[PDB]
Design a protein around this ligand. Structure first.
Ligand SMILES: *C(=O)C[C@@H]1O[C@@H](C)[C@@H](O)[C@@H](O)[C@@H]1O
Ligand SMILES: *C(=O)C[C@@H]1O[C@@H](C)[C@@H](O)[C@@H](O)[C@@H]1O
Ligand SMILES: [Ca+2]
Ligand SMILES: [Ca+2]
Ligand SMILES: [Ca+2]
Ligand SMILES: [Ca+2]
Lengths: 114, 114
């Protein structure tokens, strides 16, 4: 099934943050209504924050996360969790190789902000 | 129900990261085996990362997150979610006031690392 796509409420500020856990340099592309609205790039095997940004979901609310490593797309896993009917997390894991730890780039989207 | 307490696999490196969305200064306390292992402090209404660290879960594997503002415990919500039976997120929201957005300090714990 499709992974890394989330429908947010329209015109809502959300946070996006990416962590790296891989010897390969990770490139995280964040799309809002199918246009790139943030890209993060970095390399770390100790969970370093390679990027964090406040974006707006815009009129469509469509947010998509992609991860690639040296040009090659990573396999993604994702889910959205909602706590006390109010606090939202959209979670993404990715695997760039074979060991299947799916932490190579870890992306966390959270809203509402403020 | 108790919130903000997670049992991790023993002796396992994990990342903990906190974001702030409040007029108040957030103080996040991360306890491992009932003893303080990290403390984050900062203020932001635009989701700024007030702290990120790598810790080890140790022998018990017990990790607890606590949040306080102006010396007052914030009310917490939490859950753990596991993707492809491998990638782990322990999630915490907190409310320091009356509006119940529960984003005042947002804490994300993830493992495995590396
Ligand atoms: C390349 O060596 C594979 C790669 O980097 C490792 C350090 C480890 O993080 C692995 O999961 C990642 O796919
Ligand atoms: C105090 O004003 C309450 C407090 O700060 C606000 C800016 C808002 O973030 C609210 O959620 C937080 O509890
Ligand atoms: Ca991997
Ligand atoms: Ca990895
Ligand atoms: Ca609040
Ligand atoms: Ca708030």
């Amino acid at each position: 099934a499709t992974q890394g796509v989330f429908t947010l409420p329209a015109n809502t500020r959300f946070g996006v943050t990416a962590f790296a856990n891989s010897s390969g340099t990770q490139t995280v592309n964040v799309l809002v209504n199918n246009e790139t609205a943030a890209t993060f790039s970095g390399q770390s095997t100790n969970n370093a924050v390679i990027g964090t940004q406040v974006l707006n979901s815009g009129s469509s609310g469509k947010v998509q996360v992609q991860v690639s490593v040296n040009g090659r797309p990573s396999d993604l896993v994702s889910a959205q969790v909602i706590l006390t009917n109010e606090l939202n997390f959209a979670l993404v894991g990715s695997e760039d190789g074979t060991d299947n730890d799916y932490n190579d780039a870890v992306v966390v989207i959270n809203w509402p902000l403020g």
